[PDB]
Amino acid sequence: HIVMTQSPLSLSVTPGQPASISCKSSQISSWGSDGKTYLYWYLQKPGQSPQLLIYEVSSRFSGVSDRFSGSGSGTDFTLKISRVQAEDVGLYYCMQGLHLPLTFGQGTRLEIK
Amino acid sequence: QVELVESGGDVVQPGKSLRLSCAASGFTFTNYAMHWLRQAPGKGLEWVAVISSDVNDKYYADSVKGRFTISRDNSKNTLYLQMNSLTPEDTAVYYCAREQAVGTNPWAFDYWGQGTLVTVSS
Amino acid sequence: SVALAPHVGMGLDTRTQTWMSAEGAWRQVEKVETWALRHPGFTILALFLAHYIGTSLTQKVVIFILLMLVTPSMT
Amino acid sequence: SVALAPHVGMGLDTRTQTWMSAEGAWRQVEKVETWALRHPGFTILALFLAHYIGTSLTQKVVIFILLMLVTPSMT
Amino acid sequence: SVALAPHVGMGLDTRTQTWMSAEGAWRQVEKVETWALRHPGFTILALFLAHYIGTSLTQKVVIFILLMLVTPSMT
Amino acid sequence: MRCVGVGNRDFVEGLSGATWVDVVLEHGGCVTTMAKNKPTLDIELQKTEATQLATLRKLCIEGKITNITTDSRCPTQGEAVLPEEQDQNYVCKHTYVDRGWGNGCGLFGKGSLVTCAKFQCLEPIEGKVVQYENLKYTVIITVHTGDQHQVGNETQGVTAEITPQASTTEAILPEYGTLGLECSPRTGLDFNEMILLTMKNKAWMVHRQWFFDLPLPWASGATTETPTWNRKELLVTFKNAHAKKQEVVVLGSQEGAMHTALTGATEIQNSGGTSIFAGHLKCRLKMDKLELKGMSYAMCTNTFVLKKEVSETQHGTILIKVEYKGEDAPCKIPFSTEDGQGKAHNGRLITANPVVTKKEEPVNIEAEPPFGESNIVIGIGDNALKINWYKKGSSIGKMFEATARGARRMAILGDTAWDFGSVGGVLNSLGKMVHQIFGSAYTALFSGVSWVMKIGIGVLLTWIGLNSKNTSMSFSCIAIGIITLYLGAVVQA
Amino acid sequence: MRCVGVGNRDFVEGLSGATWVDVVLEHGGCVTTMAKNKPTLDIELQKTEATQLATLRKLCIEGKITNITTDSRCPTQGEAVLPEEQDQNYVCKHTYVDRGWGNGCGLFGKGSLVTCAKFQCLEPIEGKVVQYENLKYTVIITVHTGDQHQVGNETQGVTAEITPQASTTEAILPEYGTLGLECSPRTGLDFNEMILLTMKNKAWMVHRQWFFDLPLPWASGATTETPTWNRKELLVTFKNAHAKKQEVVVLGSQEGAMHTALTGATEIQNSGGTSIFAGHLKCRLKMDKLELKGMSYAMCTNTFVLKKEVSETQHGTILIKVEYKGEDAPCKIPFSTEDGQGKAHNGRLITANPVVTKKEEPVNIEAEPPFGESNIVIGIGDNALKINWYKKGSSIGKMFEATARGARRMAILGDTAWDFGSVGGVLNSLGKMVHQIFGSAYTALFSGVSWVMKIGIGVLLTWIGLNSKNTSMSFSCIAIGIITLYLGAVVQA
Amino acid sequence: TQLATLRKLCIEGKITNITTDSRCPTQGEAVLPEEQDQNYVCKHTYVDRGWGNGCGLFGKGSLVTCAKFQCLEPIEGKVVQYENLKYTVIITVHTGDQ
Amino acid sequence: MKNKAWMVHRQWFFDLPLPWASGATTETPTWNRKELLVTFKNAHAKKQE
Amino acid sequence: TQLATLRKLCIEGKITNITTDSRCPTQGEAVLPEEQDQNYVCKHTYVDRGWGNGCGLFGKGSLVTCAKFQCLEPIEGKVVQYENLKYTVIITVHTGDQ
Amino acid sequence: MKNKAWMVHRQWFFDLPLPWASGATTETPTWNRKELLVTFKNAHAKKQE
Ligand SMILES: *[C@@H]1O[C@H](CO)[C@@H](O[C@@H]2O[C@H](CO)[C@@H](O[C@@H]3O[C@H](CO[C@@H]4O[C@H](CO)[C@@H](O)[C@H](O)[C@@H]4O)[C@@H](O)[C@H](O[C@H]4O[C@H](CO)[C@@H](O)[C@H](O)[C@@H]4O)[C@@H]3O)[C@H](O)[C@H]2NC(C)=O)[C@H](O)[C@H]1NC(C)=O
Ligand SMILES: *[C@@H]1O[C@H](CO)[C@@H](O[C@@H]2O[C@H](CO)[C@@H](O[C@@H]3O[C@H](CO[C@@H]4O[C@H](CO)[C@@H](O)[C@H](O)[C@@H]4O)[C@@H](O)[C@H](O[C@H]4O[C@H](CO)[C@@H](O)[C@H](O)[C@@H]4O)[C@@H]3O)[C@H](O)[C@H]2NC(C)=O)[C@H](O)[C@H]1NC(C)=O
Ligand SMILES: *[C@@H]1O[C@H](CO)[C@@H](O[C@@H]2O[C@H](CO)[C@@H](O[C@@H]3O[C@H](CO[C@@H]4O[C@H](CO)[C@@H](O)[C@H](O)[C@@H]4O)[C@@H](O)[C@H](O[C@H]4O[C@H](CO)[C@@H](O)[C@H](O)[C@@H]4O)[C@@H]3O)[C@H](O)[C@H]2NC(C)=O)[C@H](O)[C@H]1NC(C)=O
Ligand SMILES: *[C@@H]1O[C@H](CO)[C@@H](O[C@@H]2O[C@H](CO)[C@@H](O[C@@H]3O[C@H](CO)[C@@H](O)[C@H](O)[C@@H]3O)[C@H](O)[C@H]2NC(C)=O)[C@H](O)[C@H]1NC(C)=O
Ligand SMILES: *[C@@H]1O[C@H](CO)[C@@H](O[C@@H]2O[C@H](CO)[C@@H](O[C@@H]3O[C@H](CO)[C@@H](O)[C@H](O)[C@@H]3O)[C@H](O)[C@H]2NC(C)=O)[C@H](O)[C@H]1NC(C)=O
Ligand SMILES: *[C@@H]1O[C@H](CO)[C@@H](O[C@@H]2O[C@H](CO)[C@@H](O)[C@H](O)[C@H]2NC(C)=O)[C@H](O)[C@H]1NC(C)=O
């Protein structure tokens, strides 16, 4: 079990501005054998099943607008959204994947200001 | 193009059993390691159980250990989640998820099912 | 990759169209043409080599054609 | 050693397959290949001897090939 | 086989006596002696080949001796 | 039926005036012998076992050394003598070791010491020999009778035993008759020149004269609790390291090197009986007592249903399997293969009498179609089953393949292949004589050369023939070179 | 001492009139610039990055086909027209199917139909360019300080930033003075013919024209989520069989199909800031203000003791590791070399001047021995430490290896290789200009010849040069044959 | 119909459990206990390492990177037999029907 | 593949370079010649990916 | 002293679990599941199979026989690095002694 | 070998035809040329032991 903490629990940003979310782990998520940090990020649109945005941290899943970008290394990771649209409202969920009992972080939210 | 559909969600009194079926299409189902996922309303997503590509490497979470059974049937392209000793806390909408096609983790989520809600009360 | 070795000259052919007849008819010649358009100097080299290795005229033309067709084809 | 002089050429051939004939055929030349790749200077020496003993190209070639075949064995 | 290519000629000679050198020296010619006494007709064949390839007596002799030395090994 | 898919069979058709056909039964492959108005029947050598082997010579791979004993003289006192040197059980060698005052002689110089050590072999190699009074050739004969479970079954057939003591035996084919099978087993494989060389619960068939030329301590060969070894110095190794003293080492387990030393030999089973599984037997076939079952039967009158799709043997024979749906007594099957777009009859049955014994059981007719495209017809001819099949190839290709097979058989059987399918004629005796002479000379002056060395000699001969101006020398040398290349390519399977 | 152990290092000796040395830094290779009185520093081009790089001509990989619509016209009147053809989202081709009274047309004949489908592309592959304003090479510098542990330590060097805006950067080193390196990043690597293409968070460096000429549908390159594509016919593979109708297919996903079409290029990271980890860069190392530390220190007297057993690197260098076991103040370490008990001093110190800053911590030195037996005396007095080292080799071998290294450097860098380790000289510039002209001609002649075709062309040209006349023989043979063979045996890196 | 599958090819692959070991120079090739598993692809190669990598002797070392390979979408090649092939022929006669 | 069926020459199908398996359906078909997919890049002699 | 092994050869081996699997004459090569394992040694050959074998198509098939392999007592291969040699020179004087 | 040593040349050692193991300590090593000891025999094309 890994305690996952997201710095903001609610973000109000006007359109055209960047919104950043910090998810800090409780232990190291870096798999020593390969040297890859195994973190994941999911967006659950209002009344929809969540999709995937950032597999690992640097990488980005297909079918995803280029604005989303993952950052950070060693238990403190961060997303960035260069331009926020009306469709970016949702419930961003950072989850670790290193250890088998996968634990999501508490759900953050992003509402248009 | 992947399509995951759920079935089996219904109202039930505590203690009684229920089996949840995840029919999948659009990919070779037999060469994958399916997961189960859930989320109570107003709460975050919670992991439930995993069945690997080889049918003999099942795992479950702590809060649901020794109470749930996960099983795949390759031929019928469905995922069976037999849940016993259900309680009003365990009720939630259940999501059936796929594995990561591109990546290194043996366990990850590419695509989420539509989602079925199971209601538990007296 | 497997994108090479097309199922072209096996000879077990029928009346109906194959997988990509119209699309795959001119693929190789288009590739050679675009390579020659991209890299012009190899034409000069091929002319020189054919002239200094070809005794007659038909031999010159044949070896020049073979070189210009093999180099993009070879890679 | 007993391992030398393999029981070959006796002439009691039969339509069955003889012992260890799957790979016993090529080990007589694999040894020559390994020895030649181990010691390359004797190629120079054998070539010099073959050239200094010769009145025709065929004679020189047979000198070189027989000498190069016979030295690794005598080793 | 590993028994082939004895570790000889490497050049790491020392004033001590090497392994099995009491009788390992002469077994490379004892094998030739046994093979020649077993199969005598190849003397005739090698002599014929050496005579039909030759412009001098020395050349014929080297043909005969090298061929007779190389065949039993290749056996 | 037992000779489908074997891959080494060959059809022996035709008979003599007295209806005897020679045939050379090879151990690997079998022989079908079709004939006019005789039930075509398959013959295979199967196993050729031997019993009551008497050992002739024993070699030993692994030895053991005990009781290392040394005794030295002074530098100029002569040779060194040990009391047990004269014994034949101790192996030892004299060397030289310098001895001053530190050694204690009292005269400086170079002395001599001998170190004799007792020797015994742990597990020797047995060397057998099979005398002709105990060979048991077991020829098995099966008839091409249309049966439900016969195709390639290889487990059912009449078994006949051929012994040098009783050369000719008459095998009784049930209800089909009897065939003479007069066989001569003493010219099979020259067993007077074979020593079986059993070792570590597995045997071989090495040449006799080669056996006597191995460099190992050879024992007596007669049964004895403690044998005497006569070249014991080929295993033990003495080392005089920089002339101070010498220890003796055993140099054990030559068994692995033996496995390499036996490259060209052929293996033989050794569980229980010897059961030699490689060889060849040449013998006749008397078919004046053979009958066709069902020659008195009627003609079939109902449609035939094909039960399993037709497949072709490598040699071209279609192997049909028909099942009879009709209420009638056992009777002959009408059979006519109309050729491509014509009524011509150019395909023939290889099964002599395709009769259906029982209504329930299906028969499986084997027949070779016309070499092009044809239509096999089975049935009454009005509602008959037109089993269609198409053969691919060229008749000239078949001739080339037959020539290749004949050449390979000639190379393998030596001169005996000249009389394989021979009815017995004026030419065959002359060919046998000339091939005897030429093969004798060729083996005499090419015996023992290797595979690659044989190929090289052949290439050299071809080059010499191509360069020599004399027509006779050039032709002879080129012919010898080509034959040598072919034999080298096909030496040892 | 950051450089030691990389196996691709190389020494740069000598200084110019005003103490500047030109070196061309390469990723994976770290130059070691020795000097007469300057500390022998090590420079490796650490990492090259690029920020705020734009996009152009994003390209498509796999597609989706929906809204398949068809329409046909009566034969021999008009041609099939469908309003969706004008739309850029629908791709479709005309074909002549047959029609008749079965299809309701009045007259029999060929009638055209059209089948258009909506091409909603998916998984684009962006191709991104970087301009010179945002380039930033980073250079790391390490000095042979003889520190306690920096033998192979990759995080023990000062770092200096380089950008085309300001390329004459400073470098302040601790207790050693400063060095100025006035590099030119404008000529190192092209980067105006390089287009970064990103696919599934993987990216390479490709030539601009080669990326432009790809048979896949290409978009405008804007940031719009739903762009309009061009040449959509390359992924729809329309097919019609029997001329009854035609159907549309998607032709799958080219993600791995172009994954070996892009096979010769170098890979990149593209993780946030796109570090490239490839290419090279030239710089002028004017070492005028870099005075070495501890010039005026005394020399020690007490004995030394080795700690880590002395070992040799790949280039013959010896890494002596010693700890001054005494009590003296910080000093300079003595050093002496003799060969065969004859003081010839056939040894050099790669480290400029070794000192012991602290008594407790050991000091490590990188000495260079001669080609043979040599005893390295470290301390002073009778009890001084002595190391006996024997480097096995010869001067001819070292010269051949240096020639091979220079040939590799010229084959990879090209004309710039003349700037490597070269003080400004008349011969260097004269060779540089000639090599620029010849290399421009050579690359214009051979731009686009494969690893397997260069060898063939070189063999054919040396064959032409073997038998020719009028000095074309010598010129063509030597020059083109040898050069093309070398470049066909080295090209793939 | 009733045709059987002969062999299966793989067109999409996933790589999991990348593991690596390296030995010092003048020592044998690096070893994993995972080299001999049926599902692992593993290639030996070389690498330079000296005192910077904690090994006393300078020179080229050997490292190996085994990886577990499982396919995601196979492609099947299925042979057709001759006892199940069925041709179907229509015989329409010109009757001059409406 | 993916609800598309083709007729190809048998020898050509064997010749093409992709990892194959026994064909009989079972769990974990041990793939042969699987090096054709995996590519082992060496990052200029320092480490492997 | 302190020899470090560099390579091991083995004289004597032992074979267990002989496993065979054949195809039909024109179905291609023969595949065993443990062929891909590096612990099993095996070689493909050709064996003709008719109806007695049970294929159903006459011809010449192919079978591969993979058997597990282990070495009983291997040969060690050492190497002595120069950091551990111990030359022991002994010197004695010509002093007249008993 | 078998409680007795030698001093053979290095380059000769790498050229023996025997299954060569890894050389690093391991309970179960992997042999890389195993076909130099075991011998397969296809006696007249019926089966092979
Ligand atoms: C390939 O790479 C993957 C990468 O994940 C590896 O996946 C591993 O899967 C196993 C499952 O078989 C995971 O095991 C889990 O380990 C947890 C570790 O917990 C701590 O570690 C110690 C060490 O044993 C534990 O003893 C303690 O409990 C520590 O807390 C462990 O908590 C977890 O338990 C879970 O399952 C049990 C059984 O159902 C429950 O009782 C328990 O409550 C909990 O739900 C598992 O045992 C392992 O963590 C995964 N790897 C990593 C890095 O996390 C594969 O193993 C690799 N190899 C292969 C061949 O796939
Ligand atoms: C070759 O080399 C082998 C071994 O290297 C020799 O083997 C010797 O065998 C003999 C008899 O087998 C051994 O003699 C035994 O000695 C026992 C010791 O008893 C005392 O010994 C001392 C000194 O010898 C005497 O002074 C005393 O008086 C005692 O005898 C002795 O007890 C024993 O007798 C016993 O034998 C039987 C079994 O046969 C027992 O059941 C019984 O209890 C009885 O007491 C033997 O006499 C001798 O030790 C062996 N040598 C060894 C081991 O080094 C061969 O003799 C050598 N030569 C030949 C030709 O093979
Ligand atoms: C290679 O070849 C070798 C031998 O040729 C094989 O070795 C096999 O090993 C396994 C396990 O070591 C053996 O299985 C044992 O079977 C016993 C039989 O019990 C019944 O068997 C039948 C049929 O199998 C079942 O239907 C029943 O339900 C029973 O299980 C079984 O009793 C035994 O368990 C016992 O093992 C422990 C020790 O480990 C005992 O202390 C304990 O009493 C326990 O009961 C095993 O399961 C198998 O028999 C062996 N095969 C043989 C001898 O032919 C390898 O498996 C082959 N493969 C490989 C990869 O090596
Ligand atoms: C090769 O030939 C042998 C002997 O002719 C065949 O064995 C025979 O096989 C049949 C088919 O199974 C057996 O018939 C069955 O017998 C049992 C018991 O009598 C009966 O219950 C069944 O209803 C059926 O009649 C027959 O008995 C058996 N004969 C024996 C063993 O002597 C064999 O099938 C042939 N083919 C092969 C591939 O071996
Ligand atoms: C490469 O350079 C770095 C930086 O100089 C080295 O890191 C340093 O390593 C030393 C030796 O282990 C550390 O000293 C130790 O410090 C701890 C706590 O300070 C102390 O308790 C120990 O007794 C010892 O003195 C030093 O702290 C450390 N400095 C850092 C990490 O900033 C590194 O060792 C060098 N080599 C390699 C291979 O990386
Ligand atoms: C093009 O195709 C889309 C879907 O492939 C069609 O949209 C569907 O429309 C029907 C009725 O209008 C709905 O019942 C479906 O749910 C729609 N599918 C969706 C939204 O995925 C569309 O009508 C087609 N035609 C055009 C002109 O777009």
* Closest to F349 (Cα-Cα) out of F307, F384, F377, F314: F377
First CA to last CA distance, chain E: 14
| CA-CA-CA-CA torsion sign (I9, I14, I20, I23) | positive
Task: Tell me, rounded to whole angstroms, the distance of Cα E66 from its chain centroid.
Answer: 8
The two tokens of residue E39 are 């199969």
Cα B53 from Cα B72, distance rounded (Å): 9
Cβ-contact D9, F264 below 8 angstroms? yes
Assess whether the C-beta atom of G120 lies below 6 angstroms from ligand 6.
no
The two tokens of residue G345 are 């001093």
Cα I20 from Cα I14, distance rounded (Å): 9
The residue to which tokens 């057709």 are assigned: H80
Q: How far is the CA of H21 from the centre of ligand 5 (A)?
A: 25
* Closest to J64 (Cα-Cα) out of J13, J98, J9, J19: J19
Backbone angles phi, psi at D70, to 5 degrees: -90, -30
Cα G335 from Cα G352, distance rounded (Å): 12
Name residues contacting ligand 1 (CB within 6 A): A 31, 98-101; B 59-62, 65, 106; H 16-17
Identify the three-state secondary structure at position G89.
Answer: coil
Cα J68 from Cα G414, distance rounded (Å): 54
Kind and range of the H or E run holding G281:
strand G280-286
> Is the pair J, I in contact (3+ CB pairs within 8 Å)?
yes
The residue to which tokens 């597995």 are assigned: F202
Greatest Cα pair distance, chain H, in angstroms, is 99
Would you list the DSSP string of E17-71? PPTTTTTTTTHHHHHHHHHHHH--HHHHHHHHHHHHS-SSHHHHHHHHHHHHHHH
The residue to which tokens 């007659």 are assigned: C56
Backbone angles phi, psi at E39, to 5 degrees: -120, 100
Separation in Å, CA of D40 to nearest CA in chain E? 13
Residues of B in contact with A103 (CB under 8 A): 47
* Closest to I38 (Cα-Cα) out of I19, I22, I20, I13: I19
Q: How many CB atoms lie within 10 A of CB K35?
A: 15
Q: Which residues contact J54 (CB under 8 A, 6 or more apart)?
A: none
User: Is G453 close to C35, i.e. CB distance below 8 A?
Assistant: no
First CA to last CA distance, chain K: 30
Subunits touching H (CB < 8 Å, at least 3 pairs)?
A, B, F, G, I, J, K
Residues of D in contact with K17 (CB under 8 A): 27, 30
> Residue G147: nearest ligand to its CA?
5
Assess whether the C-beta atom of J16 lies below 6 angstroms from ligand 3.
yes
Cα B18 from Cα B99, distance rounded (Å): 25
Cα J21 from Cα J30, distance rounded (Å): 7
User: Is F450 close to E75, i.e. CB distance below 8 A?
Assistant: yes
Residues of I with CB under 8 A from a CB of B: 27-28
User: What is the structure's resolution, reported in angstroms to one decimal?
Assistant: 3.6
Closest partner residue to F5 (CB to CB) among J11, J12, J58 is J58
The residue to which tokens 């719009």 are assigned: G224
Q: Burial level of G75, CB count in 10 A (0-12/13-18/19+)?
A: buried
Closest partner residue to K45 (CB to CB) among F7, F259, F277 is F7
Adjacent-strand bridge partners of F249: F237
The two tokens of residue F431 are 């060919």
Q: Which amino acid is at G455?
A: I
State the SS3 of D12-61.
CCCCCCCCCCCCCCCHHHHHHHHHHHHCCHHHHHHHHHHHHCCCCHHHHH
Q: Which of D13, D29, D33, D34 to probe by mutation at the K interface, max K CB count within 10 Å?
A: D34
* Closest to B98 (Cα-Cα) out of B115, B88, B113: B113
Assess whether the C-beta atom of F239 lies below 6 angstroms from ligand 4.
no
Name residues contacting ligand 2 (CB within 6 A): F 66-67
Task: Tell me, rounded to whole angstroms, the distance of Cα A57 from its chain centroid.
Answer: 9
User: Is K19 close to J10, i.e. CB distance below 8 A?
Assistant: yes
Identify the three-state secondary structure at position G397.
Answer: helix
The two tokens of residue I43 are 């990052």
Q: Burial level of F393, CB count in 10 A (0-12/13-18/19+)?
A: exposed
User: Is F4 close to J56, i.e. CB distance below 8 A?
Assistant: no
Assess whether the C-beta atom of G149 lies below 6 angstroms from ligand 5.
yes
- DSSP letter (8 states) at residue G328: P
Q: Which residues contact C49 (CB under 8 A, 6 or more apart)?
A: C63, C67, G457, G460, G461
The residue to which tokens 């800031």 are assigned: G273
User: Is A60 close to G126, i.e. CB distance below 8 A?
Assistant: no
The angle that helices F426-446 and E41-52 make with each other, rounded to 10 degrees, is 80
Discontinuities in chain A with C to N beyond 2.5 Å fall right after none
User: Is F204 close to D15, i.e. CB distance below 8 A?
Assistant: no
Q: How far is the CA of D46 from the centre of ligand 4 (A)?
A: 70
Cβ-contact F273, F20 below 8 angstroms? no
Q: How far is the CA of G149 from the centre of ligand 5 (A)?
A: 9
* Closest to F402 (Cα-Cα) out of F480, F314, F484, F337: F314
Separation in Å, CA of H28 to nearest CA in chain K? 5
Backbone angles phi, psi at D71, to 5 degrees: -65, -45
The angle that helices C57-74 and G451-466 make with each other, rounded to 10 degrees, is 150
Nearest atom within ligand 1 for CA of residue B107 = 5
User: Is K13 close to J5, i.e. CB distance below 8 A?
Assistant: no
Task: Check if D28 contacts K (Cβ < 8 Å).
Answer: no
> Is the pair K, B in contact (3+ CB pairs within 8 Å)?
no
Q: Burial level of H49, CB count in 10 A (0-12/13-18/19+)?
A: buried
Would you list the DSSP string of F335-357? EEEEETTS--B--EESSS--EE-
Closest partner residue to H10 (CB to CB) among I8, I10, I19 is I19
Nearest protein Cα to ligand 2, atom 6: F67
Cα F221 from Cα F54, distance rounded (Å): 9
Q: Which residues contact D59 (CB under 8 A, 6 or more apart)?
A: D53, E53, E54, E55, E59
Q: Annotate A77-87 with b (16+ C-beta within 10 A) or e (fewer).
A: bbbebeebeee
Q: Burial level of A96, CB count in 10 A (0-12/13-18/19+)?
A: buried
Q: Which amino acid is at I30?
A: T
Subunits touching D (CB < 8 Å, at least 3 pairs)?
E, F, K
Cβ-contact B117, B9 below 8 angstroms? yes
Cα B8 from Cα B118, distance rounded (Å): 8
Experimental determination approach used? cryo-EM
Cα G150 from Cα F316, distance rounded (Å): 80
Adjacent-strand bridge partners of B36: B49, B96
The Cβ-side half-sphere exposure at B4, using a 13 Å CA radius, reads 24
Cα F461 from Cα F479, distance rounded (Å): 9
- DSSP letter (8 states) at residue F451: H
User: Is I28 close to B53, i.e. CB distance below 8 A?
Assistant: yes
Q: Burial level of C51, CB count in 10 A (0-12/13-18/19+)?
A: exposed
Subunits touching I (CB < 8 Å, at least 3 pairs)?
B, C, G, H, J
User: Is B101 close to H17, i.e. CB distance below 8 A?
Assistant: no
- Going from the C-alpha of G355 to that of each of C75, F111, G310, G332, the distances in angstroms are 58, 64, 18, 4
> Is the pair H, D in contact (3+ CB pairs within 8 Å)?
no
Q: How far is the CA of A101 from the centre of ligand 1 (A)?
A: 8
Backbone angles phi, psi at B102, to 5 degrees: -115, 120
Q: Which residues contact H36 (CB under 8 A, 6 or more apart)?
A: J37, J38, J39, K28, K30
Adjacent-strand bridge partners of B6: B22
Cβ-contact D34, D52 below 8 angstroms? no
The residue to which tokens 């095998």 are assigned: F171
